[PDB]
Design a protein around this nucleic acid. Structure first.
Lengths: 80, 96, 103, 93, 96, 80, 103, 93
DNA sequence: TAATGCTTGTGCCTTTATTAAAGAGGAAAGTTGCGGTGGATTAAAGCACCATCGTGCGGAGAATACGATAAGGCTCTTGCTTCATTTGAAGTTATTGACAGTTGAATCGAGCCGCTCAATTGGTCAATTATGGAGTCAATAAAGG
DNA sequence: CCTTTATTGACTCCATAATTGACCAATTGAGCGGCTCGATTCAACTGTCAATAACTTCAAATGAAGCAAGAGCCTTATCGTATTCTCCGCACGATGGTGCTTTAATCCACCGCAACTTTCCTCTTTAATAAAGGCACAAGCATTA
């Protein structure tokens, strides 16, 4: 798979900023947000895949994601 | 015809999206991006639906918090427009 | 056979909490019964606090059920609970707040 | 296999506090996760306290100290009061 | 006589104090402040000397980091002077 | 004891800011820094006194301070 | 009597690390010898990395002893070690850095 | 009583890396504290991994996973390589 | 002020989907009894912690002259918002096929536990070497010209 | 560019204190044996994940017009800075008094283990009611006048 980071469309980033209270948005903010989201997903997915590989599995479960989020101080409630 | 002055519709969406609890990013593009990122760590990986849902919830929560901090930084610089420098400052202070 | 929870006047299970504490002890550790009673008491107190705030939030919205939105409202509306519960609530959203300079 | 949770006890507490207000399944799961997190934090703090003082037994004193360390301010004070009351009632019965 | 332009001596102390590793706050006033603060939690507390030394080291490290973040915030607002609003912004982004 | 927060003199705060790379310092920064330091010391000392009271002691040791700092994500090296 | 450290080709004590891991185990946990060997290997590797960087920093300053200042310089000069070691080093100071706009 | 530390082994490692460079007492104490912190982190991660997978025994696989989780990037890669080499040498003896 | 488009709050029927209520049975908590470890108690020594005293000098407090930084205002121009049109891809539904997760049994590899030996590690002491202090010189930068 | 002056690195020598090397004990790691248990392997099978196809219609892409927000510049005034003088209290050295911390021995008290019972909690099933949808309505707001 390639260039899937562009699937996070500009309207989606605008909606996320609107939920965050942002009134005006610059043009480069979309690319900056895509890069930041890519970094965050890289970290979380790396930890989740490590957890999955330890369990000798090929399928990433919600438990692995929850543990990966908890490791980085980003605890999530609503998935176990 | 009829036009709203700039900043009014934006305030309307600020009010609308803060009251809701739905997900803002489309599910299928986010799933494809997650699979693309994960294929770098291990080939032939499979994902549970709940795993991708949790990833999306966490990612959007993180992005909303980062945008709140970015708006704080932008207001600090006597501006209403958020800029990449604001995001960079917020992430630097956060330790990222 | 009277349960320890009723002896301590609690709703949370003292026996299950004691078993969990025993399984979570390290290197031949021992857990007293009073420790389990104390743990159950704080767990039930925190549950009661969060549920009371969430029920008040639900009543303010004229609904008869608690949802993750109400839990988010209750937790972010209380300074102590906001400090204690730093985790993300799925489907909770954010507290409606717009800065003065943007209006 | 059976997965043990706190849903029944959360429901009893809710019926004590709000008799006419129910709770959704997602909210109940979130409450269960929150209680699990609090119990994990208390257990970790109690184990650390036991290790520091070379005391292998975890008693109500360790739980009280862990509550004072973990819970903030007035919340910690009220939690300590509730725990003390529960322990006194348990010992007197 | 001879006067240095403002900002020169300041830069000299920036260079001097960054190269050193000594403690910047006087020991006795910090000890008195620590005892005064601790007396609010428990009456008749005694302090081991190493405890006060560790408290001073941690406090000065925290203050130096906070001042670095404050300087970042001040530079963001196109200023060289740090202001209480900069400290407040830095602490808000840090979550304090 | 009273007015001991004033024992953190303005030259000391200026030196701390100089070590932090600050070139110009406002006049209210000193009071703001005193308040922030008081809050930080309150938190650390509260945790340290809790640790000391658990050990049934009257003297606060360096171990209590180290544990209190570690609890808040402010780990300190050089005192054990 | 051959030591396990010499068998594993290590300088850190494999037996002491195994004993510490056993005392840190929870609720009838078990620790293998290979686990202790692995732990000792990573501890020795991290020690070697930090000490090599600190020795290089000391040599750059024309001194023959490692001080907390040299440890601070070595740790903050390496991205991986800076990420790993977030603790405060007593007597380490700060890395000399002045922003461009303040000059 | 005797307080056990890592000073002897840190000195051996220093002599292997820098034969002519010494270390101060403060720096040695800081290194010992850093080693203790790393060991505590690895032990905590290994215990969490053992609890998650319901496997009471902690083996080299748990330590490898904990190293991958805790140590960052190339540092984790080199640490894993060193640990695997040490385990292979130990088993071959 | 004021009309007027306009978006959002608000009321009513659907229905549906999401929660409340019950049954078996199995999993686990309570009970009783006992052994043995651990926590509370008490006494003693030592050291460390606090309070006192003298002093004396380096750092802090305060005032002065002032330069340069921050804030305010004005302009302009360009970058971002809002609206309208087309489209193309996400969402829904129905289907399927196989991969992989999970459970259950045997069993063999391996870690715990005891006890003894002895070799490594830790505390203490004498010193020698690297580091800092003090002082003068030279190289560097800064400020007015 | 220059010259004069304040600052700091460097060079030297000497004090010194801080690390290094040696010696006794004590402590725990290694060795060897026995035993139980848990991690690995195999396999069945079912849960669900990925891939497919068709339809739809809603949100995304793009462009046009225009407005207002950000950046640059100029001014000013006030407020932090550098310097000098006085003083004051921190730091060092010496001392003593005691309290409180740590250790050791004793003892009792309470917690883990084991087996049995009984009863409470947890999937599965069925009914029910609260809320999101859909549709229409009212009104506070924004916009130009």
């Amino acid at each position: 798979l390639r260039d899937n980071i562009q699937g996070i469309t500009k309207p989606a980033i605008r909606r996320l900023a609107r939920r965050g209270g942002v009134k005006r948005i610059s043009g480069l903010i979309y690319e900056e947000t895509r890069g930041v989201l890519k970094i965050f997903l890289e970290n979380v997915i790396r930890d989740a895949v490590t957890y999955t590989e330890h369990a000798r599995r090929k399928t990433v479960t919600a438990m692995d994601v929850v543990y990966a989020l908890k490791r980085q101080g980003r605890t999530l409630y609503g998935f176990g | 015809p009829h036009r709203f002055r700039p900043g009014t519709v934006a305030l309307r969406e600020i009010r609308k999206y803060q009251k809701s609890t739905e997900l803002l990013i489309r599910k299928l593009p986010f799933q494809r991006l997650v699979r693309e990122i994960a294929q770098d760590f291990k080939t032939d990986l499979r994902f549970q639906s709940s795993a991708v849902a949790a990833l999306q919830e966490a990612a959007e929560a993180y992005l909303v918090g980062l945008f709140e901090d970015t708006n704080l930084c932008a207001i600090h610089a006597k501006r209403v427009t958020i800029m990449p420098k604001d995001i960079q400052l917020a992430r630097r202070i956060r330790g990222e | 056979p009277i349960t320890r929870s009723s002896r301590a006047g609690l709703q949370f299970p003292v026996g299950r909490v004691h078993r969990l504490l025993k399984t979570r002890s390290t290197a031949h550790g021992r857990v007293g019964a009073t420790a389990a009673v104390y743990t159950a008491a704080i767990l039930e107190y925190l549950t009661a606090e969060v549920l009371e705030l969430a029920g008040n939030a639900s009543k303010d919205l004229k609904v008869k059920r608690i949802s993750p939105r109400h839990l988010q409202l209750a937790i972010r509306g209380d300074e102590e609970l906001d400090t204690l519960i730093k985790g993300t609530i799925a489907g909770g959203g954010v507290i409606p707040h717009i800065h003065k300079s943007l209006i | 296999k059976n997965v043990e949770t706190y849903k029944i006890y959360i429901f009893k507490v809710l019926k004590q506090v709000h008799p006419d207000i129910g709770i959704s399944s997602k909210a109940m799961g979130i409450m269960n996760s929150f209680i699990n997190d609090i119990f994990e934090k208390l257990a970790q703090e109690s184990s650390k306290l036991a290790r520091y003082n070379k005391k292998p037994t975890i008693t109500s004193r360790e739980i009280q100290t862990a509550v004072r360390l973990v819970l903030p301010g007035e919340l910690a004070k009220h939690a300590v009061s509730e725990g003390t009351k529960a322990v006194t009632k348990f010992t007197s019965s």
